[PDB]
Scaffold this active site. Structure first.
Site, PDB file in Angstrom:
ATOM      1  N   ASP A 136       2.167-105.756 -16.551  1.00 21.41           N
ATOM      2  CA  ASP A 136       1.383-105.307 -17.697  1.00 21.41           C
ATOM      3  C   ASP A 136       1.476-106.178 -18.970  1.00 21.41           C
ATOM      4  OD1 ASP A 136      -0.156-103.686 -19.462  1.00 21.41           O
ATOM      5  OD2 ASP A 136       1.261-102.030 -19.460  1.00 21.41           O
TER       6      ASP A 136
ATOM      7  N   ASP B 224      -5.363-108.008 -21.230  1.00 21.50           N
ATOM      8  CA  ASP B 224      -4.547-106.928 -20.668  1.00 21.50           C
ATOM      9  C   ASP B 224      -4.639-106.737 -19.160  1.00 21.50           C
ATOM     10  OD1 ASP B 224      -3.055-104.600 -20.271  1.00 21.50           O
ATOM     11  OD2 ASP B 224      -4.200-103.357 -21.669  1.00 21.50           O
TER      12      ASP B 224
HETATM   13  C1  6T6 Z   1       0.777 -98.519 -20.515  1.00 20.73           C
HETATM   14  C2  6T6 Z   1      -0.588 -98.794 -19.854  1.00 20.73           C
HETATM   15  C3  6T6 Z   1      -0.730 -98.118 -18.491  1.00 20.73           C
HETATM   16  C4  6T6 Z   1       0.043 -97.006 -18.138  1.00 20.73           C
HETATM   17  C5  6T6 Z   1      -0.065 -96.414 -16.881  1.00 20.73           C
HETATM   18  C6  6T6 Z   1      -0.973 -96.911 -15.953  1.00 20.73           C
HETATM   19  C7  6T6 Z   1      -1.762 -98.025 -16.281  1.00 20.73           C
HETATM   20  C8  6T6 Z   1      -2.788 -98.540 -15.328  1.00 20.73           C
HETATM   21  C9  6T6 Z   1      -3.822 -97.692 -14.874  1.00 20.73           C
HETATM   22  C10 6T6 Z   1      -4.786 -98.206 -14.008  1.00 20.73           C
HETATM   23  C11 6T6 Z   1      -4.719 -99.551 -13.648  1.00 20.73           C
HETATM   24  N1  6T6 Z   1      -3.751-100.334 -14.099  1.00 20.73           N
HETATM   25  C12 6T6 Z   1      -2.789 -99.877 -14.894  1.00 20.73           C
HETATM   26  C13 6T6 Z   1      -1.638 -98.609 -17.556  1.00 20.73           C
HETATM   27  N2  6T6 Z   1      -0.664-100.250 -19.713  1.00 20.73           N
HETATM   28  C14 6T6 Z   1      -1.573-100.696 -20.525  1.00 20.73           C
HETATM   29  N3  6T6 Z   1      -1.932-102.011 -20.684  1.00 20.73           N
HETATM   30  C15 6T6 Z   1      -2.204 -99.557 -21.225  1.00 20.73           C
HETATM   31  C16 6T6 Z   1      -3.303 -99.739 -22.210  1.00 20.73           C
HETATM   32  C17 6T6 Z   1      -4.567 -99.157 -22.002  1.00 20.73           C
HETATM   33  C18 6T6 Z   1      -5.584 -99.367 -22.930  1.00 20.73           C
HETATM   34  C19 6T6 Z   1      -5.358-100.170 -24.050  1.00 20.73           C
HETATM   35  C20 6T6 Z   1      -4.109-100.762 -24.258  1.00 20.73           C
HETATM   36  C21 6T6 Z   1      -3.082-100.549 -23.343  1.00 20.73           C
HETATM   37  N4  6T6 Z   1      -1.662 -98.442 -20.808  1.00 20.73           N
END
Ligand code: 6T6
Length: 375
Positions: free
Chosen positions: A36, A219
Site C-alpha cells: 500500500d 496509490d
Molecule cells: C488503508 C487503505 C485500505 C484499507 C483496506 C483495504 C484496502 C483495499 C481495498 C481494495 C483494494 N485494495 C486495497 C485499502 N489503503 C489505502 N491506500 C486506502 C485509501 C483509500 C482512498 C484514499 C486514500 C487511501 N485505504
C-alpha cells in the site's frame, strides 16, 4: 536475494489489491500483506476474524516487544483498532534482510478485511506524516533503509490477468523504452501533479489546479482512478460521447454495476484512451501516461458469469483529490524514488494493448502559458 529473485513476488485478485509474503516474529510467522503506497502503517491482523486464514500470534514470538500504546484507525466506512509493538520483520522474496519494525497488531476491525482477498495485513509504504497515531511512528520502509544498506527506492510492477515489488533498485527487465520522472510534491502520500488530461487526445480544457484539487496521489492500495467531482463529470461526459454506439445504465457510470459482453467480444474500440500528463523534472515540461479501456474497465471474475466477460467502470468520483490507483499503475513500471523525491513511469512487460492501441509513456511535452498546477 537480488532483483532476479524479487521478480513475481506479488499476487492478488482483481479489485482486492496486491500482496507480498512477509514474516513477523521469531520463529517467523508467514503472512500475506497488501502492498500500500497510500498509507504508512504496517498493520497486521493479530486476532481471529471470519475473513482471516491466519493472524499474528504475539505470544508465540520471543522477539516481540509491546509499546504500551493503542492505535485506532477509522476510514470512510471501515475501521481497525490495534496495539503497537515492535518485532522482527522480513520479506522472503524481497531484500535478503531482517529488520526490527513497528507493528500495529489489529485486535478489532469493521469492514477492513475482505472475504477471499488472501491478505492478513497492510504494508503502508508512504511517509511518516500520515502514520497513525502520529508522525513519530516510524514506517517500515524508513526502518529498512536505516537498519540495512538498502538504497532508498522501491518499484512496483502491477499486472492484470500478480507482479513484482523490487526493493532497493531498478530492474531494467521489467520495462521497455524511457523512464519518465514526475516530482514527489510533498512527502506524506506519494503526492504528484497532473498538468493536463485528454480523452482520445481531446483536452478537457480546465484550469490544471482542478486535476489536483486538493491533492493527486499514486496509490497501490486504491483500485480505481479516483477523480475530483468537476474532472470526473467531464471525463464521464467524454467517455459516454465516444462510446455512444452503446448505452449503459447510470449504475454502470457510478461504478456499482457490471457491463457484460459474450466472451471475447468486448468492443474495446468504442471506448477512448485517457491521457494523464504529469509535471516533469524541468519547468513546464511534462510527459503523459496513456490509459486504455483494458485498464479502466476492470474485469470482475465470477464463475457464475463466466460464459461472458463482465466489467466494472473503474473510474470514480472523489472528494479527497485525484487517486491514481492500481488500474492506473497496471501495465507500467512505477519507480518510487524516495532518494530523489520523484516517481518514474515506464511501459512494463505486462502492459495492456490490442491490435490498434497500446499503453504508453511519452514525452517531453512543452507548455508556455503554464501557472503552478498544485493547490
Ligand atoms: C488503508 C487503505 C485500505 C484499507 C483496506 C483495504 C484496502 C483495499 C481495498 C481494495 C483494494 N485494495 C486495497 C485499502 N489503503 C489505502 N491506500 C486506502 C485509501 C483509500 C482512498 C484514499 C486514500 C487511501 N485505504
Amino acid at each position: 536475494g537480488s532483483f532476479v529473485e524479487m521478480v513475481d513476488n506479488l499476487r492478488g485478485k482483481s479489485g482486492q489489491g496486491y500482496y507480498v509474503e512477509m514474516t513477523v516474529g521469531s520463529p517467523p510467522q508467514t503472512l500475506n500483506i497488501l502492498v500500500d503506497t497510500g498509507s504508512s502503517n504496517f498493520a497486521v491482523g493479530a486476532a481471529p476474524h471470519p475473513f482471516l486464514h491466519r493472524y499474528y500470534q504475539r505470544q508465540l514470538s520471543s522477539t516481540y516487544r509491546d509499546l504500551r500504546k493503542g492505535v485506532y484507525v477509522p476510514y470512510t466506512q471501515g475501521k481497525w483498532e490495534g496495539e503497537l509493538g515492535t518485532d522482527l520483520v522480513s520479506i522472503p522474496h524481497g531484500p535478503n534482510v531482517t529488520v526490527r519494525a513497528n507493528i500495529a497488531a489489529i485486535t478489532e476491525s469493521d469492514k477492513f478485511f475482505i472475504n477471499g482477498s488472501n491478505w492478513e495485513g497492510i504494508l503502508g509504504l508512504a511517509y511518516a506524516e500520515i502514520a497513525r497515531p502520529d508522525d513519530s511512528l516510524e514506517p517500515f520502509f524508513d526502518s529498512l533503509v536505516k537498519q540495512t544498506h538498502v538504497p532508498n527506492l522501491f518499484s512496483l510492477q502491477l499486472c492484470g490477468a500478480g507482479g513484482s515489488m523490487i526493493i532497493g533498485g531498478i530492474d531494467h527487465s521489467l520495462y521497455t523504452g524511457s523512464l519518465w520522472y514526475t516530482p514527489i510534491r510533498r512527502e506524506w502520500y506519494y503526492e504528484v501533479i497532473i498538468v493536463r488530461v485528454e480523452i482520445n487526445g481531446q483536452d478537457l480544457k480546465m484550469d490544471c489546479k482542478e486535476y489536483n484539487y486538493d491533492k493527486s496521489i499514486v496509490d497501490s492500495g486504491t483500485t480505481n482512478l479516483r477523480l475530483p467531482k468537476k474532472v470526473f463529470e467531464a471525463a464521464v461526459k467524454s467517455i459516454k460521447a465516444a462510446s455512444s454506439t452503446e448505452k449503459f445504465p447510470d449504475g454502470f457510470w457510478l461504478g456499482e454495476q457490471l457491463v457484460c459482453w459474450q466472451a471475447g467480444t468486448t468492443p474495446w474500440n468504442i471506448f477512448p484512451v485517457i491521457s494523464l500528463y504529469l509535471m516533469g523534472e524541468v519547468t513546464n515540461q511534462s510527459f503523459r501516461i496513456t490509459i486504455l479501456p483494458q485498464q479502466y474497465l476492470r474485469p470482475v471474475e465470477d464463475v457464475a458469469t463466466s460464459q461472458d466477460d463482465c466489467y466494472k467502470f473503474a473510474i470514480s468520483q472523489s472528494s479527497t483529490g485525484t487517486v491514481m490507483g492500481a488500474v492506473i499503475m497496471e501495465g507500467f513500471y512505477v519507480v518510487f524514488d524516495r532518494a530523489r523525491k520523484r516517481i518514474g513511469f515506464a511501459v512494463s512487460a505486462c502492459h495492456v494493448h490490442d491490435e490498434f492501441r497500446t499503453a504508453a509513456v511519452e514525452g517531453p511535452f512543452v507548455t508556455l502559458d503554464m501557472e503552478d498546477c498544485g493547490y
